[PDB]
CSV table of C-alpha atoms and ligand atoms in Angstrom, one decimal:
chain,number,residue,atom,x,y,z
A,12,UNK,CA,31.3,15.4,8.5
A,13,UNK,CA,29.6,13.2,5.5
A,14,UNK,CA,27.9,14.6,2.4
A,15,UNK,CA,23.9,13.1,1.4
A,16,UNK,CA,24.4,10.6,-1.4
A,17,UNK,CA,22.9,12.4,-4.4
A,18,UNK,CA,19.3,10.8,-4.9
A,19,UNK,CA,16.3,11.7,-4.1
A,20,UNK,CA,13.8,8.5,-3.0
A,21,UNK,CA,9.6,8.4,-4.5
A,22,UNK,CA,7.7,5.9,-2.8
A,23,UNK,CA,4.6,4.3,-4.5
A,24,UNK,CA,4.0,0.3,-3.4
A,25,UNK,CA,0.5,-1.5,-4.9
A,26,UNK,CA,-1.3,0.0,-7.7
A,27,UNK,CA,0.1,2.9,-9.9
A,28,UNK,CA,1.7,6.2,-9.1
A,29,UNK,CA,-1.1,8.8,-9.4
A,30,UNK,CA,-0.3,11.3,-12.3
A,31,UNK,CA,-0.7,14.4,-10.5
A,32,UNK,CA,1.9,12.2,-7.8
A,33,UNK,CA,3.8,11.6,-11.3
A,34,UNK,CA,4.4,15.6,-11.8
A,35,UNK,CA,5.2,16.7,-8.8
A,36,UNK,CA,9.0,14.0,-8.9
A,37,UNK,CA,9.1,15.4,-12.6
A,38,UNK,CA,9.0,18.9,-11.2
A,39,UNK,CA,11.8,18.1,-8.7
A,40,UNK,CA,13.0,15.8,-11.4
A,41,UNK,CA,13.4,18.6,-13.3
A,42,UNK,CA,14.2,21.8,-11.0
A,43,UNK,CA,17.7,19.1,-9.0
A,44,UNK,CA,19.6,17.5,-12.1
A,45,UNK,CA,22.1,16.8,-10.3
A,46,UNK,CA,20.7,14.8,-8.6
A,47,UNK,CA,18.8,10.9,-9.3
A,48,UNK,CA,15.3,11.1,-9.2
A,49,UNK,CA,14.0,7.7,-8.0
A,50,UNK,CA,10.2,5.9,-7.4
A,51,UNK,CA,10.1,2.5,-5.7
A,52,UNK,CA,8.1,-0.1,-6.2
A,53,UNK,CA,7.0,-3.3,-5.6
A,54,UNK,CA,7.3,-5.8,-8.7
A,55,UNK,CA,5.2,-8.9,-6.1
A,56,UNK,CA,1.8,-6.7,-5.9
A,57,UNK,CA,2.0,-4.4,-9.0
A,58,UNK,CA,-0.2,-4.8,-12.2
A,59,UNK,CA,2.6,-5.7,-14.8
A,60,UNK,CA,1.1,-4.2,-17.8
A,61,UNK,CA,0.3,-0.8,-16.2
A,62,UNK,CA,4.0,-1.1,-13.7
A,63,UNK,CA,5.9,-1.5,-18.2
A,64,UNK,CA,4.3,0.6,-18.9
A,65,UNK,CA,4.7,3.5,-16.0
A,66,UNK,CA,8.7,2.5,-15.9
A,67,UNK,CA,9.2,3.1,-19.6
A,68,UNK,CA,7.5,6.3,-19.4
A,69,UNK,CA,9.7,7.0,-16.5
A,70,UNK,CA,12.4,6.3,-18.5
A,71,UNK,CA,11.2,9.4,-20.3
A,72,UNK,CA,10.6,11.7,-18.0
A,73,UNK,CA,13.8,11.2,-16.5
A,74,UNK,CA,12.5,9.2,-13.5
A,75,UNK,CA,14.6,6.2,-12.2
A,76,UNK,CA,12.6,2.7,-11.5
A,77,UNK,CA,14.1,0.7,-9.0
A,78,UNK,CA,11.9,-2.7,-7.0
A,79,UNK,CA,12.5,-3.0,-3.3
A,80,UNK,CA,12.2,-6.8,-3.5
A,81,UNK,CA,15.7,-7.0,-7.1
A,82,UNK,CA,17.4,-3.7,-5.1
A,83,UNK,CA,17.1,-5.7,-1.4
A,84,UNK,CA,15.7,-3.1,0.9
A,85,UNK,CA,12.5,-6.0,1.4
A,86,UNK,CA,13.3,-7.3,4.8
A,87,UNK,CA,10.5,-10.4,5.8
A,88,UNK,CA,8.4,-7.7,7.9
A,89,UNK,CA,8.0,-5.6,4.9
A,90,UNK,CA,6.8,-7.9,2.6
A,91,UNK,CA,4.6,-10.1,5.7
A,92,UNK,CA,2.1,-6.8,5.3
A,93,UNK,CA,2.8,-5.3,1.2
A,94,UNK,CA,1.4,-9.8,1.2
A,95,UNK,CA,-1.6,-8.5,2.6
A,96,UNK,CA,-5.1,-8.0,1.0
A,97,UNK,CA,-5.8,-4.9,2.2
A,98,UNK,CA,-2.6,-3.8,3.2
A,99,UNK,CA,-1.4,-0.7,5.9
A,100,UNK,CA,1.2,1.3,2.3
A,101,UNK,CA,1.4,3.7,5.4
A,102,UNK,CA,3.5,1.3,7.4
A,103,UNK,CA,5.3,-0.2,4.8
A,104,UNK,CA,6.2,3.3,3.3
A,105,UNK,CA,7.9,3.9,7.0
A,106,UNK,CA,9.1,1.3,7.3
A,107,UNK,CA,10.8,1.0,3.6
A,108,UNK,CA,11.9,4.3,3.5
A,109,UNK,CA,14.5,3.4,6.8
A,110,UNK,CA,16.3,0.3,4.3
A,111,UNK,CA,16.6,2.4,1.7
A,112,UNK,CA,18.1,4.9,2.8
A,113,UNK,CA,20.6,3.1,5.2
A,114,UNK,CA,21.3,1.5,1.4
A,115,UNK,CA,21.5,4.5,-0.8
A,116,UNK,CA,22.0,7.4,1.1
A,117,UNK,CA,20.0,10.4,-0.5
A,118,UNK,CA,16.6,12.1,0.9
A,119,UNK,CA,13.5,10.6,1.2
A,120,UNK,CA,10.6,13.0,-0.3
A,121,UNK,CA,6.5,12.5,0.3
A,122,UNK,CA,4.8,12.7,-3.5
A,123,UNK,CA,2.6,15.4,-2.0
A,124,UNK,CA,6.1,18.1,-1.4
A,125,UNK,CA,6.2,20.4,-4.1
A,126,UNK,CA,9.8,21.4,-5.1
A,127,UNK,CA,9.8,26.2,-4.5
A,128,UNK,CA,13.5,25.9,-4.3
A,129,UNK,CA,16.1,23.4,-5.7
A,130,UNK,CA,18.6,22.0,-2.7
A,131,UNK,CA,22.4,22.6,-2.9
A,132,UNK,CA,24.6,20.7,-5.5
A,133,UNK,CA,26.0,20.3,-2.3
A,134,UNK,CA,24.4,19.2,1.8
A,135,UNK,CA,25.7,18.6,4.4
A,136,UNK,CA,25.1,16.4,7.6
A,137,UNK,CA,27.4,17.0,10.7
A,138,UNK,CA,25.8,12.9,11.3
A,139,UNK,CA,25.3,11.6,8.4
A,140,UNK,CA,21.5,12.5,9.3
A,141,UNK,CA,19.4,15.2,8.9
A,142,UNK,CA,15.2,16.1,9.5
A,143,UNK,CA,12.7,18.8,8.4
A,144,UNK,CA,11.3,21.3,11.5
A,145,UNK,CA,7.6,21.2,9.5
A,146,UNK,CA,5.4,20.3,11.3
A,151,UNK,CA,4.1,21.0,16.7
A,152,UNK,CA,4.7,17.3,15.5
A,153,UNK,CA,8.0,15.2,13.9
A,154,UNK,CA,7.6,15.3,10.3
A,155,UNK,CA,9.3,12.2,9.1
A,156,UNK,CA,8.0,12.5,5.1
A,157,UNK,CA,11.2,14.3,5.2
A,158,UNK,CA,14.6,12.2,5.9
A,159,UNK,CA,18.2,12.9,4.3
A,160,UNK,CA,21.2,10.6,5.2
A,161,UNK,CA,24.3,9.7,4.1
A,162,UNK,CA,24.8,5.7,2.4
A,163,UNK,CA,25.4,3.8,5.5
A,164,UNK,CA,24.3,6.0,8.2
A,165,UNK,CA,24.7,4.6,12.0
A,166,UNK,CA,21.3,6.5,12.9
A,167,UNK,CA,19.2,5.6,10.1
A,168,UNK,CA,20.3,1.5,10.4
A,169,UNK,CA,19.5,1.7,14.1
A,170,UNK,CA,15.6,3.1,13.3
A,171,UNK,CA,15.6,0.4,10.8
A,172,UNK,CA,16.6,-2.9,13.0
A,173,UNK,CA,13.8,-0.8,15.8
A,174,UNK,CA,10.7,0.1,13.3
A,175,UNK,CA,11.7,-3.7,12.4
A,176,UNK,CA,10.6,-4.3,15.8
A,177,UNK,CA,7.9,-1.8,16.3
A,178,UNK,CA,6.4,-3.5,13.5
A,179,UNK,CA,6.6,-7.0,14.9
A,180,UNK,CA,4.6,-6.7,18.5
A,181,UNK,CA,2.5,-4.2,16.9
A,182,UNK,CA,-0.2,-6.6,17.4
A,183,UNK,CA,0.1,-5.1,21.3
A,184,UNK,CA,-0.4,-1.5,20.3
A,185,UNK,CA,-1.8,0.5,22.8
A,186,UNK,CA,-4.1,4.2,21.7
A,187,UNK,CA,-2.8,5.0,25.2
A,188,UNK,CA,-1.5,8.8,26.3
A,189,UNK,CA,-0.5,10.8,23.8
A,190,UNK,CA,-2.1,8.1,21.4
A,191,UNK,CA,-6.0,8.2,23.2
A,192,UNK,CA,-5.9,11.9,22.2
A,193,UNK,CA,-4.8,10.7,19.2
A,194,UNK,CA,-7.0,7.7,18.3
A,195,UNK,CA,-10.5,10.0,18.8
A,196,UNK,CA,-9.3,13.4,16.7
A,197,UNK,CA,-7.1,11.9,13.7
A,198,UNK,CA,-9.3,7.9,13.7
A,199,UNK,CA,-7.7,4.4,15.1
A,200,UNK,CA,-5.7,3.2,11.6
A,201,UNK,CA,-3.6,6.7,11.6
A,202,UNK,CA,-2.6,6.5,14.9
A,203,UNK,CA,-1.5,3.3,16.2
A,204,UNK,CA,0.6,4.2,12.3
A,205,UNK,CA,1.7,7.2,14.1
A,206,UNK,CA,3.0,5.0,16.8
A,207,UNK,CA,4.4,1.7,15.6
A,208,UNK,CA,5.9,3.2,12.4
A,209,UNK,CA,5.5,7.0,12.0
A,210,UNK,CA,6.6,9.9,14.2
A,211,UNK,CA,4.9,8.7,17.6
A,212,UNK,CA,7.6,5.6,16.5
A,213,UNK,CA,10.3,8.2,15.0
A,214,UNK,CA,10.1,10.0,18.5
A,215,UNK,CA,10.4,7.6,21.5
A,216,UNK,CA,13.7,6.5,19.1
A,217,UNK,CA,15.2,9.7,19.0
A,218,UNK,CA,14.2,10.2,22.4
A,219,UNK,CA,16.3,7.4,23.3
A,220,UNK,CA,19.2,8.2,20.9
A,221,UNK,CA,19.5,11.3,22.7
A,222,UNK,CA,19.6,13.5,19.3
A,223,UNK,CA,16.0,15.0,21.0
A,224,UNK,CA,16.2,16.3,24.8
A,225,UNK,CA,14.1,16.0,28.4
A,226,UNK,CA,12.4,18.9,26.6
A,227,UNK,CA,11.1,17.9,23.4
A,228,UNK,CA,7.2,16.2,23.9
A,229,UNK,CA,5.8,14.4,20.5
A,230,UNK,CA,3.2,17.1,20.5
A,231,UNK,CA,5.9,19.5,20.7
A,232,UNK,CA,9.9,18.7,19.6
A,233,UNK,CA,11.0,22.7,20.6
A,234,UNK,CA,13.3,22.2,17.6
A,235,UNK,CA,14.9,25.3,19.3
A,236,UNK,CA,16.1,23.3,22.0
A,237,UNK,CA,17.9,20.9,20.3
A,238,UNK,CA,20.9,20.2,18.3
A,239,UNK,CA,20.9,22.3,15.0
A,240,UNK,CA,22.9,20.2,13.3
A,241,UNK,CA,20.5,17.9,12.8
A,242,UNK,CA,19.0,20.4,11.0
A,243,UNK,CA,18.4,20.8,7.3
A,244,UNK,CA,19.8,24.0,6.6
A,245,UNK,CA,21.1,24.0,10.2
A,246,UNK,CA,18.2,26.2,11.5
A,247,UNK,CA,15.0,26.2,12.5
A,248,UNK,CA,13.0,28.9,9.4
A,249,UNK,CA,11.1,27.1,7.4
A,250,UNK,CA,13.6,25.1,4.2
A,251,UNK,CA,12.7,27.1,0.9
A,252,UNK,CA,13.0,24.4,-1.2
A,253,UNK,CA,9.7,22.2,0.6
A,254,UNK,CA,6.0,23.6,0.2
A,255,UNK,CA,2.2,21.6,-0.3
A,256,UNK,CA,-1.4,23.1,-0.6
A,263,UNK,CA,-5.0,10.2,2.8
A,264,UNK,CA,-4.2,7.8,-0.3
A,265,UNK,CA,-3.0,5.0,2.4
A,266,UNK,CA,-6.0,5.9,5.0
A,267,UNK,CA,-9.0,3.5,4.2
A,268,UNK,CA,-8.2,-0.2,3.3
A,269,UNK,CA,-8.4,-0.6,-0.4
A,270,UNK,CA,-7.4,-4.6,-1.1
A,271,UNK,CA,-4.3,-4.6,-3.0
A,272,UNK,CA,-3.8,-5.1,-7.4
A,273,UNK,CA,-5.8,-8.8,-8.2
A,274,UNK,CA,-7.3,-10.2,-5.3
A,275,UNK,CA,-10.3,-9.9,-7.4
A,276,UNK,CA,-8.6,-12.3,-9.8
A,277,UNK,CA,-7.0,-14.8,-7.6
A,278,UNK,CA,-8.7,-18.1,-6.8
A,279,UNK,CA,-10.3,-19.3,-3.3
A,280,UNK,CA,-7.9,-21.4,-3.2
A,281,UNK,CA,-4.7,-19.0,-4.3
A,282,UNK,CA,-6.1,-16.3,-1.5
A,283,UNK,CA,-6.1,-19.6,2.1
A,284,UNK,CA,-2.6,-20.5,0.9
A,285,UNK,CA,-1.5,-16.3,1.0
A,286,UNK,CA,-3.4,-16.6,4.5
A,287,UNK,CA,-2.4,-19.9,4.9
A,288,UNK,CA,1.6,-18.2,4.9
A,289,UNK,CA,1.2,-15.2,6.5
A,290,UNK,CA,-1.0,-16.3,9.4
A,291,UNK,CA,2.3,-18.9,9.7
A,292,UNK,CA,4.7,-15.4,9.6
A,293,UNK,CA,2.4,-14.2,12.9
A,294,UNK,CA,2.5,-17.5,15.0
A,295,UNK,CA,6.1,-17.9,14.1
A,296,UNK,CA,6.9,-14.3,15.4
A,297,UNK,CA,4.3,-13.4,17.0
A,298,UNK,CA,2.0,-16.5,18.6
A,299,UNK,CA,-0.3,-14.5,18.2
A,300,UNK,CA,-3.2,-16.4,15.9
A,301,UNK,CA,-5.8,-13.2,14.0
A,302,UNK,CA,-8.0,-15.6,12.1
A,303,UNK,CA,-10.9,-12.8,12.2
A,304,UNK,CA,-9.0,-10.5,10.7
A,305,UNK,CA,-7.9,-12.9,8.2
A,306,UNK,CA,-11.5,-14.3,8.0
A,307,UNK,CA,-13.0,-10.7,6.6
A,308,UNK,CA,-10.3,-10.1,3.9
A,309,UNK,CA,-10.9,-13.4,3.0
A,310,UNK,CA,-14.5,-13.0,3.0
A,311,UNK,CA,-14.4,-9.9,0.3
A,312,UNK,CA,-15.1,-11.2,-3.2
A,313,UNK,CA,-15.7,-7.9,-5.5
A,314,UNK,CA,-16.0,-9.0,-9.4
A,315,UNK,CA,-13.3,-10.7,-11.4
A,316,UNK,CA,-12.5,-8.6,-14.9
A,317,UNK,CA,-9.6,-9.4,-17.5
A,318,UNK,CA,-9.3,-6.6,-19.9
A,319,UNK,CA,-7.8,-8.7,-23.6
A,320,UNK,CA,-4.3,-7.7,-24.5
A,321,UNK,CA,-1.9,-9.6,-26.8
A,322,UNK,CA,-2.4,-13.2,-25.6
A,323,UNK,CA,-5.0,-15.2,-25.1
A,324,UNK,CA,-7.2,-14.3,-21.7
A,325,UNK,CA,-7.5,-16.7,-18.5
A,326,UNK,CA,-10.8,-17.2,-18.4
A,327,UNK,CA,-12.5,-17.1,-14.7
A,328,UNK,CA,-16.1,-18.3,-14.6
A,329,UNK,CA,-18.3,-15.0,-13.7
A,330,UNK,CA,-15.7,-12.5,-14.7
A,331,UNK,CA,-15.5,-9.5,-17.1
A,332,UNK,CA,-13.5,-10.0,-20.9
A,333,UNK,CA,-12.9,-6.8,-21.9
A,334,UNK,CA,-12.3,-6.8,-25.5
A,335,UNK,CA,-9.4,-3.1,-26.8
A,336,UNK,CA,-11.2,-2.1,-30.6
A,337,UNK,CA,-8.7,-2.7,-33.1
A,338,UNK,CA,-7.1,0.5,-34.6
A,339,UNK,CA,-8.9,3.1,-33.0
A,340,UNK,CA,-12.3,4.1,-34.7
A,341,UNK,CA,-12.6,0.5,-34.0
A,342,UNK,CA,-14.9,-0.3,-31.1
A,343,UNK,CA,-14.5,-2.0,-27.6
A,344,UNK,CA,-16.6,-5.2,-26.8
A,345,UNK,CA,-17.3,-6.4,-23.3
A,346,UNK,CA,-18.9,-9.3,-21.9
A,347,UNK,CA,-20.1,-11.2,-19.1
A,348,UNK,CA,-18.6,-14.9,-18.9
A,349,UNK,CA,-21.3,-16.8,-16.4
A,350,UNK,CA,-19.3,-20.7,-17.5
A,351,UNK,CA,-17.0,-19.6,-20.2
A,352,UNK,CA,-20.3,-19.4,-21.5
A,353,UNK,CA,-19.5,-15.5,-22.8
A,354,UNK,CA,-22.6,-13.2,-22.9
A,355,UNK,CA,-22.9,-9.6,-24.7
A,356,UNK,CA,-23.4,-6.7,-22.5
A,357,UNK,CA,-24.6,-4.0,-25.4
A,358,UNK,CA,-23.0,-1.5,-24.7
A,359,UNK,CA,-25.8,2.0,-24.5
A,360,UNK,CA,-24.2,4.5,-27.7
A,361,UNK,CA,-22.6,8.2,-25.7
A,362,UNK,CA,-22.8,9.8,-28.8
A,363,UNK,CA,-26.1,10.2,-30.2
A,364,UNK,CA,-27.3,11.4,-26.4
A,365,UNK,CA,-30.5,10.8,-27.5
A,366,UNK,CA,-31.4,8.6,-24.0
A,367,UNK,CA,-34.0,8.7,-22.1
A,368,UNK,CA,-34.1,10.1,-18.0
A,369,UNK,CA,-34.4,6.5,-16.9
A,370,UNK,CA,-30.6,6.0,-18.6
A,371,UNK,CA,-28.7,9.0,-16.9
A,372,UNK,CA,-28.3,6.6,-14.4
A,373,UNK,CA,-27.0,3.8,-16.2
A,374,UNK,CA,-23.9,2.5,-14.5
A,375,UNK,CA,-22.8,0.9,-18.5
A,376,UNK,CA,-23.5,4.0,-20.0
A,377,UNK,CA,-20.8,5.9,-17.7
A,378,UNK,CA,-18.2,2.8,-18.5
A,379,UNK,CA,-18.7,3.2,-22.2
A,380,UNK,CA,-18.7,7.2,-22.1
A,381,UNK,CA,-15.3,5.7,-19.4
A,382,UNK,CA,-14.0,4.5,-23.0
A,383,UNK,CA,-15.3,7.1,-24.9
A,384,UNK,CA,-11.9,9.3,-23.4
A,385,UNK,CA,-9.4,6.3,-24.3
A,386,UNK,CA,-6.4,8.6,-25.9
A,387,UNK,CA,-5.4,5.3,-28.1
A,388,UNK,CA,-8.4,2.5,-27.7
A,389,UNK,CA,-5.8,-0.2,-29.3
A,390,UNK,CA,-2.8,0.9,-26.7
A,391,UNK,CA,-4.4,2.6,-23.7
A,392,UNK,CA,-1.8,4.6,-20.8
A,393,UNK,CA,-0.8,2.5,-17.6
A,394,UNK,CA,-3.8,4.9,-16.1
A,395,UNK,CA,-6.7,4.8,-18.4
A,396,UNK,CA,-5.4,0.6,-17.4
A,397,UNK,CA,-6.3,1.3,-14.3
A,398,UNK,CA,-9.1,3.4,-14.4
A,399,UNK,CA,-11.5,0.8,-16.2
A,400,UNK,CA,-9.6,-1.9,-13.7
A,401,UNK,CA,-11.1,0.2,-11.3
A,402,UNK,CA,-14.4,0.7,-13.3
A,403,UNK,CA,-14.4,-3.4,-14.2
A,404,UNK,CA,-13.9,-4.2,-10.2
A,405,UNK,CA,-16.8,-2.8,-8.6
A,406,UNK,CA,-19.9,-2.7,-12.3
A,407,UNK,CA,-22.8,-3.7,-11.2
A,408,UNK,CA,-24.8,-3.6,-14.6
A,409,UNK,CA,-29.0,-2.9,-13.5
A,410,UNK,CA,-29.1,-5.9,-16.4
A,411,UNK,CA,-29.5,-9.3,-13.5
A,412,UNK,CA,-28.2,-11.6,-16.9
A,413,UNK,CA,-24.8,-8.7,-16.9
A,414,UNK,CA,-24.3,-9.1,-13.0
A,415,UNK,CA,-21.3,-10.7,-11.9
A,416,UNK,CA,-22.9,-13.1,-9.0
A,417,UNK,CA,-19.9,-12.8,-6.7
A,418,UNK,CA,-20.3,-16.5,-4.8
A,419,UNK,CA,-18.2,-16.4,-2.1
A,420,UNK,CA,-17.9,-18.7,1.1
A,421,UNK,CA,-18.9,-16.3,4.1
A,422,UNK,CA,-16.1,-15.1,7.1
A,423,UNK,CA,-17.0,-18.2,8.9
A,424,UNK,CA,-16.3,-21.2,7.4
A,425,UNK,CA,-13.5,-19.4,6.1
A,426,UNK,CA,-11.9,-19.9,9.8
A,427,UNK,CA,-12.8,-22.5,9.9
A,428,UNK,CA,-11.0,-23.7,7.2
A,429,UNK,CA,-7.9,-21.3,8.0
A,430,UNK,CA,-7.8,-23.3,11.6
A,431,UNK,CA,-8.1,-26.2,10.0
A,432,UNK,CA,-5.4,-26.4,7.8
A,433,UNK,CA,-3.0,-23.7,11.6
A,434,UNK,CA,-3.9,-26.0,12.9
A,435,UNK,CA,-2.9,-29.6,11.8
A,436,UNK,CA,0.4,-28.5,11.2
A,437,UNK,CA,2.2,-29.6,14.2
A,438,UNK,CA,4.6,-27.2,14.4
A,439,UNK,CA,2.5,-24.0,14.4
A,440,UNK,CA,-0.4,-25.7,16.4
A,441,UNK,CA,2.2,-25.6,19.2
A,442,UNK,CA,3.4,-22.2,19.3
A,443,UNK,CA,0.0,-21.1,19.2
A,444,UNK,CA,-0.1,-19.2,22.3
A,445,UNK,CA,-3.9,-16.5,21.5
A,446,UNK,CA,-6.2,-17.4,19.3
A,447,UNK,CA,-8.5,-13.8,18.2
A,448,UNK,CA,-12.2,-15.1,17.1
A,449,UNK,CA,-15.3,-13.7,17.6
A,450,UNK,CA,-17.0,-17.0,16.3
A,451,UNK,CA,-19.2,-19.2,17.9
A,452,UNK,CA,-17.8,-22.5,15.8
A,453,UNK,CA,-14.8,-22.0,16.5
A,454,UNK,CA,-14.2,-20.8,20.1
A,455,UNK,CA,-14.5,-23.7,21.5
A,456,UNK,CA,-12.0,-25.3,19.2
A,457,UNK,CA,-10.0,-22.5,20.3
A,458,UNK,CA,-10.7,-23.6,24.1
A,459,UNK,CA,-9.8,-27.3,23.6
A,460,UNK,CA,-6.3,-26.3,22.2
A,461,UNK,CA,-6.4,-23.7,25.3
A,462,UNK,CA,-6.4,-27.6,27.7
A,463,UNK,CA,-4.6,-29.0,25.5
A,464,UNK,CA,-1.5,-26.8,25.7
A,465,UNK,CA,-2.7,-26.5,29.9
A,466,UNK,CA,-1.9,-31.3,30.1
A,467,UNK,CA,2.3,-30.4,28.8
B,501,LIG,MG1,0.8,4.4,-1.1
């Protein structure tokens, strides 16, 4: 019937794609010259300088980089997860892949799948929709599609709804098992947006038959026209010998002000209340209590200077020197970078962060023009840098969780529209349980 559009889609939102993953995508691009390799990104949550460097390098590698916001694929639902301080990138990619495929067609792939064999110049899908029989379980990390395919469009709408209701997801039945073997985050991702969600949809849609179970698909029993290559053989195209499962702060959170973070939380909660009636106060309070080091790497433009931060000045010429400062009250105190070349160190200085930090700086190819990955690594070091010298330690004075919760409560419940839409508030904080009770009584008398 239809043909899979000649596009290969890869998604990496948040920080820059690791170089290992860039190499895999490059191979897919070289081995499949007839196909346009595209890496999808989100400019709203990405480090701008590093992203610009990446887009240029990808242009040199023959890889198209597209933004989800500019192409109209980021539904407000995906934007709600990406604007979270620690986003579940797995749920985001599981949702963006369906919207991207539905708008451009082509093949979605995970950057960990390697190309062993080039794809056919034309791939035909009797239903405009193909999956791989790899994994047993259902693989959602290889998906082929013709632009606008109805199945993909239905999945895209259904995943949105699943996500909206994610807070009512229970680890029951097949998920009860999986909670204990893989973890909570992982198991919930699979039920809400991943293969679990997908299985139920493909069952509901009749694409999978009576016999298939979530952990025993039985592809050999199914309609083979839904499978790449029209059979249950392992396709030649793919090969595989983690990232999204640990919750990491999205970029620059350490460099936002308390008030800006409060403001972001208030917007997200409003979304939650308006879509679900649920006020997950402690989720927000426990994100917002975390304050890692503020930091800036001095670029051509002059730096906005946060009190209590690190400022790193790159060198003028390649054989110039890096300089680091602890900014205290906009006063700049210069931390002594330990010499790493003369060696001649004492055993004390082996564990020293500053020495290890200097070593990292010395390994920059071009100190005047560092790569995105070099910038990324230095950033990462700065976020966690903790000298033995207490005088050069970032202080990171920050409100505790319960105070933050109190502030979020005041702001949300002072809005009469939101206040009246709240059905259920989650908080374990003793000072806030009676305020939640009071609102419950208020609602009870109307
Ligand atoms: Mg990712």
